[PDB]
Design a binder for these strands. Structure first.
Ligand SMILES: Nc1ncnc2c1ncn2[C@@H]1O[C@H](COP(=O)(O)OP(=O)(O)O)[C@@H](O)[C@H]1O
Length: 964
RNA sequence: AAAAA
């Protein structure tokens, strides 16, 4: 249940600004200031019968911590919650000041001789927070996969995975913990890692209190109700849209000299400015940077979609120079101080050598490809303001204390792996946050380079959209299940029942039932149409529609259609059946060869790509974006609707998108698409539609294409049998048919909707993912990881202790003894298959000593995949076997034999940064494979694993962090 | 494509 709900207005005045324009962006005030206001919303979830006092009435007598500045309403409220011992979820933008709240919780815990845990999503963030907190409190420690420092500290900074582990082991630390702070909780919605947060939260004692720090989310109250329900305690939410440094949003149409303000500091969308920007749409990054360095709006960050891009843009800037030699002095000292902390052999590395020149010119690069030490030294140089321009990958925005005055996006679209799509509102929100250093800059500038006549409503949805929901991403894992079986007080079902996924599911039932009710009435508001005899007329037409589709499926099959798609052939295009491009003309076709992915499978209809000329293309469609032989048209590419101009274009399609084939062929220029050739085909297209006003002649499947299979003719006669049966109904000739059909069809639609919804609420009655739990239990029982009564076996106990790699395969390898006759260097090379994920250029064939153990483990892998398949788990057996990459087996092998980093870097195309990260994961995996051999009494194995650790842990691989 | 324990 909810209570104490209030919204509170806040208001300030800011220095007026013209930004990059010529007039004042906002109508100024008498004082010469600009007034901006923001909202602070509060609400609390209460357990049954709880004795609660309104939070605004609370007066804090003793402050556990004081601050130089005056607190914002959202901060004062959140701190009042903590002072009272009540959990709180703080939802605000990155710059707002959520650390102030977390700090107070820490101060309070330390004064009360209690312990407190601070969790973060990323190692990098952990280190930065440890460094920041240590300075302010002193009694601080750090727990991470890499480093452990002062574990007995009052305040522990650790990663969420590390906390998850502690809980399952039931450590004596939690017994003394009063508060647990979750920084960036919204990561709980991560498709792959999100479950870690949920799992961790559920496992916490009801005695502990929480501070959840999150970006602005629309469903914060849901999260709080869930906490309240599973931990039987109050949980507040403090939400605000407050933005410390006001933002200005600009569009930069490519290849132009214009720069347009489209969204001002009041989040007002400038309709006319946007119209001007789109009208001016028909090097640039260089122009823009120069303009920023000139107007003195640096430091600036330029986000690219790939590492490769960040480096190329960097080289195009080494012409410019932003630093005074007095700055180049302090800069280099910092750089060399850090570099000197590396082993002597590594201070000469190429990446280190080639990057310093840029740094001195004041140009930075930042992405996962860099050496860990280069990443942190560049982050530090940015803080001190020695770097005026930083070409960064999308991650930087996540990093704390790395804000910039100006932020530049090089494109309005992004490649998410599946589609080349528009940035979403949610994305863009988190994207705007990186601009504006709280104390230093009046305003923050955001610039987005655009190269397409985007529609207004699409632009609004992106530049002025809503924040994304915090939805559960819960799923089951074997390690998780085994641990829940093992631990005494709880079970796997317990986890399911307490998930936020299950919670959200339960909360939607009333929502769905309300909708059904609306539907039923709407369905009876039609009551009955005139005549039930229209039902027959509807069914007969439905069957015909279906049979006619089957006919189309045959006609368009390559075995029939291809012989009739000569250049110039008239075809009716309908891609996905939702985009009628009307009648186009075949340019050519070709069989589809997937070079990047061999084992990819094409349907017969997908197997051929047909190039087609259409003249119904929407005039503002991004035609420069569709690639050759790629049938997946980007969004924004659509047919023109009523009242829109059209153009000519060649688009790639499959045989599925051919609605019908015409009995005509117009002239197709052999001269490709060249300066006005296809526009003449559009002419011929226009003329043909005039020659045949009634309609375009369709090839007769039987009399022209000669399709006469016994089965196809049986089909073509089922249609006629109906086509007559229909034209003998009193309704075909009757009047008001187009009205009695519409009335009935709508009812039919309501009916279907109600049915499908009825299933939804039915399926939603049971606890979530029980079916999957059952199947995974089979796999575990079958492999002997536990008894049919779900009591954990030795295999299972081992598997629980394995977290850095596939727990099932690794446990099997260990028990089948696949490591017994392997030298340490061999063991390392094999395990790299469990520590490596990214794919790359196929590595040279493996020699016997490495290729053998590989094959012996792929056998065990297949044996497990088959079992996973038998259990009816959605898994591609072969793909699972390949899940474990071996592209670095020879790299790890040699490195364990003394080879230099510079030497192994020449064995692969994998970035230095990626190499180190995987070596560190391998160490982690090995450290786990040592704690295991302890709990198995395999002296032979423990020693071999300990030997692997020494071979790996050396040189640049074992180098420490700059911070700590 | 980019992040990531
Ligand atoms: N009420 C306030 N008035 C002025 N400055 C503040 C206030 N609250 C926080 N700050 C400052 O703003 C900066 C950003 O705060 P911080 O909490 O680090 O960001 P986050 O919201 O990501 O935790 C900090 O350096 C902090 O000192």
């Amino acid at each position: 249940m909810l209570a104490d709900s209030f919204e509170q207005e806040a208001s300030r005045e800011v220095d007026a600004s013209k930004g990059l324009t010529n007039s004042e962006t906002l109508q100024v005030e008498q004082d010469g200031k600009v007034r901006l206001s923001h909202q602070v919303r509060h609400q609390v979830a209460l357990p049954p019968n709880y004795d609660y006092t309104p939070i605004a009435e609370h007066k804090r007598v003793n402050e556990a911590r004081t601050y130089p500045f005056t607190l914002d309403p959202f901060q004062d409220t959140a701190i009042s919650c903590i002072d009272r011992g009540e959990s709180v979820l703080v939802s605000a933008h990155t710059s707002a000041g959520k650390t102030v709240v977390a700090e107070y919780a820490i101060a309070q815990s330390l004064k009360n001789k209690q312990r407190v845990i601070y969790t973060s999503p990323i190692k990098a963030l952990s280190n930065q927070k440890y460094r920041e907190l240590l300075a302010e409190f002193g009694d601080v420690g750090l727990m991470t996969g890499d480093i452990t420092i002062n574990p007995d500290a009052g305040c522990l900074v650790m990663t969420t995975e590390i906390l998850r582990s502690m809980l399952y082991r039931g450590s004596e630390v939690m017994r003394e913990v009063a508060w647990v702070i979750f920084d960036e909780v919204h990561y709980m919605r991560d498709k792959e890692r999100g479950v870690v947060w949920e799992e961790t939260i559920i496992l916490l004692p009801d005695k502990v209190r929480y501070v959840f720090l999150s970006a602005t989310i629309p469903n914060a109250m849901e999260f709080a109700e869930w906490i309240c329900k599973i931990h039987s305690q109050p949980c507040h939410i403090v939400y605000t849209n407050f933005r410390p440094t006001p933002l200005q949003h600009y569009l930069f149409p490519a290849h132009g000299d214009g720069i347009y303000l489209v969204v001002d500091e009041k989040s007002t969308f400038r309709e006319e400015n946007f119209q001007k920007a789109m009208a001016s749409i028909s090097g640039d990054i260089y122009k823009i940077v120069k303009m920023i360095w000139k107007k003195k709006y640096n430091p600036v960050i330029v986000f690219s979609f790939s590492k490769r891009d960040c480096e190329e843009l960097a080289l195009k800037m080494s012409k410019l120079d932003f630093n005074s030699d007095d700055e180049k002095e302090a800069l280099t000292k910092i750089f060399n101080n850090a570099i000197a902390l590396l082993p002597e052999t590594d201070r000469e590395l190429p990446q280190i050598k080639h990057i310093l020149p840029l740094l001195r010119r004041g140009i930075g690069i930042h992405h996962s490809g860099l050496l860990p030490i280069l990443k942190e030294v560049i982050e530090i140089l940015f803080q001190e303001g020695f770097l005026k321009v930083l070409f960064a990958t999308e991650t930087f925005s996540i990093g704390l204390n790395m804000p910039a005055k100006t932020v530049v996006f090089t494109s309005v679209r992004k490649w998410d792996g599946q589609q080349f799509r528009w940035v979403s509102g949610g994305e863009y929100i988190q994207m705007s946050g990186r601009a504006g250093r709280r104390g230093l800059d009046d305003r923050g500038i955001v610039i987005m380079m655009i190269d397409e006549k985007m529609e207004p409503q699409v632009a609004k949805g992106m530049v002025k959209g809503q924040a994304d929901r915090l939805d559960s991403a819960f799923h089951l894992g074997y390690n998780m299940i085994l641990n829940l079986m093992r631990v005494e007080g709880i079970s796997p079902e317990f986890m399911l029942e307490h998930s936020f996924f299950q919670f959200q599911n339960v909360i939607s039932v009333p929502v769905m039932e309300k909708k059904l009710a609306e539907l039923k009435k709407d369905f009876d508001g039609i009551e009955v149409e005139d005549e039930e005899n229209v039902k027959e007329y509807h069914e007969i037409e439905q069957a015909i529609k279906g049979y006619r589709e089957d006919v189309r499926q045959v006609v368009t099959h390559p075995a029939n259609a291809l012989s009739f798609l000569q250049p110039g052939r008239l075809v009716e295009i309908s891609v996905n059946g939702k985009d009628n491009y009307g009648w186009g003309a075949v340019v050519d076709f070709a069989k589809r060869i997937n070079k990047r992915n061999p084992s990819a499978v094409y349907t017969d209809h997908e197997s051929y790509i047909v190039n087609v000329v259409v003249n119904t293309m929407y005039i503002d469609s991004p035609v420069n974006l569709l690639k050759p032989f790629n049938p997946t048209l980007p969004e924004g590419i659509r047919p023109a609707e009523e009242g829109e101009k059209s153009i000519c274009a060649v688009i790639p399609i499959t045989l599925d998108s051919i609605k019908s084939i015409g009995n005509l062929r117009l002239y197709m220029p052999k001269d490709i698409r060249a300066s006005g050739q296809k526009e003449t085909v559009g002419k011929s297209l226009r003329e043909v539609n005039r020659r045949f006003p009634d309609g375009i002649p369709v090839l007769d499947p039987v009399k022209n294409m000669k399709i006469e299979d016994e089965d196809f003719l049986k089909l073509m006669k089922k249609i006629d049998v109906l086509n007559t049966k229909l034209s003998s109904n009193p309704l075909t000739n009757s009047m008001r048919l187009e009205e009695l059909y519409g009335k009935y069809s709508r009812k039919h639609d309501l009916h279907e909707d109600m049915k499908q919804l009825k299933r939804k609420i039915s399926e939603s009655q049971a606890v979530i993912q029980l079916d999957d739990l059952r199947r995974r239990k089979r796999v575990l029982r079958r492999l002997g990881f536990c008894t049919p009564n779900d009591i954990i076996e030795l295999k299972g106990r081992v598997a629980c202790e394995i977290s850095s790699g596939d727990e099932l395969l690794l446990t099997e390898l260990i028990f089948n003894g696949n490591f017994n006759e392997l030298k340490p260097e061999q063991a390392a090379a094999l395990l790299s298959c469990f520590a490596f994920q990214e794919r790359c250029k196929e590595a040279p064939r493996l020699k016997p000593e490495l290729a053998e153990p590989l094959k012996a483990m792929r056998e065990i892998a297949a044996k497990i995949a088959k079992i996973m398949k038998d259990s009816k788990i959605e898994v591609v057996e072969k793909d699972y076997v390949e899940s474990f990459r071996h592209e670095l087996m020879e790299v790890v092998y040699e490195w364990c034999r003394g080879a230099t980093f510079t030497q192994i870097c020449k064995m692969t195309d994998v970035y230095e940064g990626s190499l180190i990260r995987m070596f560190k994961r391998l160490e982690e995996l090995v450290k786990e494979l040592v704690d295991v051999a302890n709990t198995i009494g395999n002296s032979s194995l423990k020693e071999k694993m300990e030997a692997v650790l020494k071979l790996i842990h050396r040189d640049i691989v074992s180098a420490g962090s700059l911070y700590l």
